[PDB]
């Protein structure tokens, strides 16, 4: 135990999280918090239309918020109130282009209704 030997490659182990064509890495272990168990599919009850998840495009990661967190921000301070199925679209429209320009959100342009889970990784780059 406790044998530090850094090299040119660095010291620690890097963990991955691969999706369709997006790999984003973290040195640190996540602090996972899961507010509810995983939802059942529920297209049987209210849809006769052709239902398909577009998991090769929708399950990619996409940056929806970046913000400077200075020391000038006080104690009880909001930093981002993200409304997450909206913020995926309003971030793209904040990039001054349409929803159909991004692979993640083209079925929102076409389809009328959506039910699905959402993974969120709030990464920080502090010293």
């Amino acid at each position: 135990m406790d044998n530090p030997n850094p090299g040119p490659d660095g010291e620690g182990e890097v963990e991955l999280e691969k999706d369709s064509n997006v790999v984003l890495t973290t040195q640190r272990d996540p602090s996972t918090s899961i507010p509810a168990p995983v939802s059942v599919k529920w297209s049987r009850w209210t849809s006769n239309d052709v239902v398909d998840d577009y998991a090769t495009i929708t399950s990619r990661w996409y940056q929806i918020a970046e913000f400077v967190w200075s020391k000038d921000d006080p104690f009880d301070k909001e930093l981002a109130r993200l409304i997450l199925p909206r913020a995926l679209l309003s971030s793209i429209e904040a990039n001054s282009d349409a929803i159909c320009d991004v692979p993640n959100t083209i079925p929102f342009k076409v389809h009328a209704y959506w039910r699905g889970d959402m993974e969120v990784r709030v990464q920080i780059n502090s010293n």
């Binding site: 049987r44 009850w45 849809s47 006769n48 239309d49 052709v50």
Partner: protein
């Protein structure tokens, strides 16, 4: 004929049958005989004595 059905041009998939609300509400509403046994207001009158 009335209920004839020549060419069903179906675009739908299968919809899960609830059993007329049995799956959600704990009671079926298919039989309309048992909805008829809820009491409905039949009449309403003011007692008017003449003689």
């Amino acid at each position: 004929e009335e209920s004839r059905n020549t060419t069903v041009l179906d675009t739908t998939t299968t919809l899960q049958s609830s059993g007329f609300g049995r799956a959600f509400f704990g009671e079926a509403f298919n039989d309309l005989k048992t909805l008829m046994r809820r009491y409905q207001l039949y009449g309403q009158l003011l007692l008017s004595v003449t003689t």
